[PDB]
Amino acid sequence: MIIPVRCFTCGKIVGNKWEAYLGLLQAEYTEGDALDALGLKRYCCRRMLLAHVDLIEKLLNYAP
C-alpha cells in the first residue's frame, strides 16, 4: 500500500525516495534516469520504486 522502508533484498533505505521519484518523473525524467538520480544502482532497489503501487493515496479518498 505504501512504499517499503527498506529494499527487501539488501535493506537499503527506499522510504525517503518515493516522493522524490514522483517529482523527478513529473520533471520529464525517464524512470531509468530518475532511479539513477536517486542513487538506486542495484536492480533490486530499482525494482522497489519501479514496481511500487501507491495504494495508500487512493485509500485516503475514503472518509475515515
Partner 1 sequence: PYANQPTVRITELTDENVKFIIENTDLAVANSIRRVFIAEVPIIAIDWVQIDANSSVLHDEFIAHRLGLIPLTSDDIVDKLQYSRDCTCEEFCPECSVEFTLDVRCNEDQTRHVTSRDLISNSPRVIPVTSDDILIVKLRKGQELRLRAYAKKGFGKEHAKWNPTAGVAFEYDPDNALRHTVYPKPEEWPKSEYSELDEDESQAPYDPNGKPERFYYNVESCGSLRPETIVLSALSGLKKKLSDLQTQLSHEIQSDV
Partner 2 sequence: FIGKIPIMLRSTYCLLNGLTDRDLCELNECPLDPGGYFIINGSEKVLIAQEKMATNTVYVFAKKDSKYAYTGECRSCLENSSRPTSTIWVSMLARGGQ
Partner 3 sequence: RKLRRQMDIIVSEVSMIRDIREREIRIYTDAGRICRPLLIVEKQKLLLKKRHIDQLKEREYNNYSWQDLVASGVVEYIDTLEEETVMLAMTPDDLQEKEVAYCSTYTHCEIHPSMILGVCASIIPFPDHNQSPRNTYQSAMGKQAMGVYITNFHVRMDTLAHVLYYPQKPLVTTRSMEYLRFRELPAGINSIVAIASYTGYNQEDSVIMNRSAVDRGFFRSVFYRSYKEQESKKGFDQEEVFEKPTRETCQGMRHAIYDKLDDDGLIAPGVRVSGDDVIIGKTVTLPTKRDCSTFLRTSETGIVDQVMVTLNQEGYKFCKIRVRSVRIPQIGDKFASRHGQKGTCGIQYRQEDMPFTCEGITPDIIINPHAIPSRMTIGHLIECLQGKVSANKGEIGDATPFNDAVNVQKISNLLSDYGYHLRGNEVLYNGFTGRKITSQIFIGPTYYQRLKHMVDDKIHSRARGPIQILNRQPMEG
Binding-site annotation, residues for Zn(2+): 7, 10, 44-45
Which of positions 3-62 make contact with partner 3 (CB under 8 A)? 4-11, 30-36, 42-44, 46-47, 50-53, 55, 58-59, 62
CB of 9 to partner 3, least distance (A): 5
Look up residue 52 and give its amino acid: H
Dihedral Cα 20, 4, 15, 57, nearest 10 deg: 50
Among partner 3, Zn ion, partner 1, none, what binds residue 17 when CB lies within 5 to 8 Å by partner kind? partner 1
Place of cell 472518509: 63
**Residue 22 backbone phi and psi in degrees, to 5:** -65, -40
